[PDB]
Structures are given as structure tokens and as C-alpha cells.
Design an enzyme around this catalytic site. Sequence first.
Site, PDB file in Angstrom:
ATOM      1  N   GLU A  31      27.125  24.057  19.186  1.00  0.00           N
ATOM      2  CA  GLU A  31      27.092  25.489  20.039  1.00  0.00           C
ATOM      3  C   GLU A  31      26.620  25.324  21.397  1.00  0.00           C
ATOM      4  O   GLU A  31      25.897  24.459  21.790  1.00  0.00           O
ATOM      5  CB  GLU A  31      26.278  26.290  19.360  1.00  0.00           C
ATOM      6  CG  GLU A  31      24.974  25.856  18.601  1.00  0.00           C
ATOM      7  CD  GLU A  31      24.815  26.444  17.220  1.00  0.00           C
ATOM      8  OE1 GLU A  31      24.918  27.866  17.063  1.00  0.00           O
ATOM      9  OE2 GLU A  31      24.128  25.646  16.622  1.00  0.00           O
ATOM     10  N   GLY A  32      27.277  26.245  22.378  1.00  0.00           N
ATOM     11  CA  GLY A  32      27.063  26.032  23.735  1.00  0.00           C
ATOM     12  C   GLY A  32      28.094  26.993  24.514  1.00  0.00           C
ATOM     13  O   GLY A  32      29.223  27.278  23.888  1.00  0.00           O
ATOM     14  N   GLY A  33      28.121  27.031  25.806  1.00  0.00           N
ATOM     15  CA  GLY A  33      29.086  27.803  26.665  1.00  0.00           C
ATOM     16  C   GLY A  33      29.469  29.086  26.141  1.00  0.00           C
ATOM     17  O   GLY A  33      30.456  29.570  26.336  1.00  0.00           O
ATOM     18  N   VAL A  36      30.288  28.865  19.415  1.00  0.00           N
ATOM     19  CA  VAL A  36      30.470  27.713  18.619  1.00  0.00           C
ATOM     20  C   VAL A  36      31.817  26.646  18.704  1.00  0.00           C
ATOM     21  O   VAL A  36      32.808  27.096  19.115  1.00  0.00           O
ATOM     22  CB  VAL A  36      30.282  28.190  17.062  1.00  0.00           C
ATOM     23  CG1 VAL A  36      30.123  27.041  16.145  1.00  0.00           C
ATOM     24  CG2 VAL A  36      28.846  28.925  17.092  1.00  0.00           C
ATOM     25  N   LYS A  50      36.439  26.389  20.916  1.00  0.00           N
ATOM     26  CA  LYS A  50      35.182  26.906  21.297  1.00  0.00           C
ATOM     27  C   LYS A  50      35.520  28.632  21.175  1.00  0.00           C
ATOM     28  O   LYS A  50      36.474  28.803  21.693  1.00  0.00           O
ATOM     29  CB  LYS A  50      34.818  26.723  22.676  1.00  0.00           C
ATOM     30  CG  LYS A  50      33.199  27.315  22.920  1.00  0.00           C
ATOM     31  CD  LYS A  50      32.995  28.088  24.223  1.00  0.00           C
ATOM     32  CE  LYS A  50      32.596  27.460  25.302  1.00  0.00           C
ATOM     33  NZ  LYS A  50      32.954  28.266  26.620  1.00  0.00           N
ATOM     34  N   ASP A 145      24.420  23.478  34.628  1.00  0.00           N
ATOM     35  CA  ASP A 145      23.984  23.011  33.386  1.00  0.00           C
ATOM     36  C   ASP A 145      24.086  21.397  33.155  1.00  0.00           C
ATOM     37  O   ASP A 145      24.457  20.973  32.079  1.00  0.00           O
ATOM     38  CB  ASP A 145      24.229  23.649  32.175  1.00  0.00           C
ATOM     39  CG  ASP A 145      23.401  23.581  30.898  1.00  0.00           C
ATOM     40  OD1 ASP A 145      22.181  23.166  31.071  1.00  0.00           O
ATOM     41  OD2 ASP A 145      23.733  24.201  29.607  1.00  0.00           O
ATOM     42  N   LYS A 147      23.234  17.907  32.252  1.00  0.00           N
ATOM     43  CA  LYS A 147      22.486  17.198  31.206  1.00  0.00           C
ATOM     44  C   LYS A 147      23.232  16.330  30.512  1.00  0.00           C
ATOM     45  O   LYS A 147      24.620  16.568  30.322  1.00  0.00           O
ATOM     46  CB  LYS A 147      21.754  18.213  30.286  1.00  0.00           C
ATOM     47  CG  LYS A 147      22.550  19.248  29.527  1.00  0.00           C
ATOM     48  CD  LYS A 147      21.905  20.326  28.806  1.00  0.00           C
ATOM     49  CE  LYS A 147      22.572  20.922  27.955  1.00  0.00           C
ATOM     50  NZ  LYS A 147      21.667  21.728  27.019  1.00  0.00           N
ATOM     51  N   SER A 148      22.776  15.401  29.653  1.00  0.00           N
ATOM     52  CA  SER A 148      23.253  14.462  28.923  1.00  0.00           C
ATOM     53  C   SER A 148      24.101  14.818  27.652  1.00  0.00           C
ATOM     54  O   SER A 148      25.424  14.490  27.625  1.00  0.00           O
ATOM     55  CB  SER A 148      22.417  13.300  28.569  1.00  0.00           C
ATOM     56  OG  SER A 148      22.096  12.291  29.343  1.00  0.00           O
TER      57      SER A 148
END
Length: 287
Positions: A31-33, A36, A50, A145, A147-148
Site C-alpha cells: 500500500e502507498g501512493g 493498494v 494501483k 518520499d 526511501k529504500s
Amino acid sequence: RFHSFSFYELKNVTNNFDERPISVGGNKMGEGGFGVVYKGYVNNTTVAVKKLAAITTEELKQQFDQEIKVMAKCQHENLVELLGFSSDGDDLCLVYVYMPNGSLLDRLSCLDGTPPLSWHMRCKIAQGAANGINFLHENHHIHRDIKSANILLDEAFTAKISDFGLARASTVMTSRIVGTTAYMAPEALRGEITPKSDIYSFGVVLLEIITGLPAVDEHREPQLLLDIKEEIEDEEKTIEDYIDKKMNDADSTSVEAMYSVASQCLHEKKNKRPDIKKVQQLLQEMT
């Protein structure tokens, strides 16, 4: 241009958006942007779908519209590629190229039993991600945002920067603070919007690549990887005490060269940090 899907197509190809994790037999990848992400299989191709979830509606269409507009203009080997979208109804979907090696976070953590990434491969991944960010900054976008977990890895472990849309144009202030705490520059945490904050966040990714440690581990002391950095500056600690032990090819010299780049990126004063272009030069000189 992009492929126009209808919702019924995406439903069929994702087992009717089967929200169980893939481990468990479902199609959910994360989940993100604002949605899901599910795995789909359409026209002999594995894709990432997405499905946007509602902040509120009406601003969702605006954000979906904006993410498409950003992707139409942002095509580069170190950026995730958008394939198409679905907009029929109260339902909004974005369809992306599938990245079979998952996230850099997951690979640094050897999730699901994948082999440890070598130092040589980590160096390539770091350069690739810097290239992706440089394309974004050259084209007046701020990721917001870095990040790894947002650096994806294709078949060849090429780094693919994902999750923009929210990628603002380029010091602005904001009432709705976004980003991931453990990676955020101090001025971003107070709401300043600036490409110098992506650099800071990239410094954090570099420490994760060096050490194999997540930016935050709540069962670790210190919980924040950032602090570990101050230990090295202030407390007789060395980066070498921190080098990921899951590598057999990490030479002292390039380890230190990457750490020095990380350390420059991590200046608390935004104005002292290198720009992405300098970070590229440095990461190139490193190999």
C-alpha cells in the site's frame, strides 16, 4: 500514449483485487501512493495495478490526474514506467511496469529468503537511484518520499524510483505534511517543500545500503539510523563497525567514499547539502 483500461479488465486480471498478500495466495503487493497495489497478468505481461483509495474524493481525481501528467513527462530508465490507467466510475487505477525484484528495502532485508546484495551491486543500485532523482530534479520535480521501500528493482536489479504523482514542481509551505519520518529532512518535517529534502532522504538510503539496517527499527537502539550517524561523528564509532556483515566484497575505500557522500547529503542545513548532480559525480568517482 498510455493504455486506457476499463475497471472490469483490471478486476479480472487481479483475481477481483484479491487483497491477501501474494505469500498467502492473494494479489496484494503493498500500500502507498494513496492506494493498494496488486499484481495483475494482462496480455502475457505481469503488471502492478494501483487502485486508489480515499483523504477525500474529488481531490483523488485531481491527484490521479496529476500523477498521470507527471508520468507522461517523466520517462527514464531509473523511473518506474506507467503503462495505463482506469478511470470509469468511482474507481481509479494506475497500471505500471512490474518490477520482479521488489524493493531495495526488502532486498537489503533478504525478505523471503533472497540472497544478500553484494557491495558491487549496491554501488550500481545507488548510482541508478541517483540518476533517477537527477532526472526528476532536472525536470523540476520533487519526489517528497525518497526511501529504500520506494526504490524498486527490475530483472537486472536496475533501480526504479517509484511513487510520485505527489511529486511537486520546483521554498513552499504545506498544512498536509507527507513523507516517511525516519527519512525526512528537518525542514520537510516542518513543511518546507524543496528538492534539497530529497537529497537528505537519499543520504539515509545510502546508510541503509552501507549497513543493511532499516532507517527505523523499533527494537533497535538507537531506533533511528540517523542517530547512528551522530554516534560516528561524536562517539569514537566508525562506519566500519556498521558495514553490513552480509557482504564479502565491501572494500574500506569505497565504503568510506559512499559514507562521505551520505554524510554530505545529511547536513542539517539544507543549503550545505550537495545537489543531485554532485551526488552523481561522487558516486561515479566512487567506482
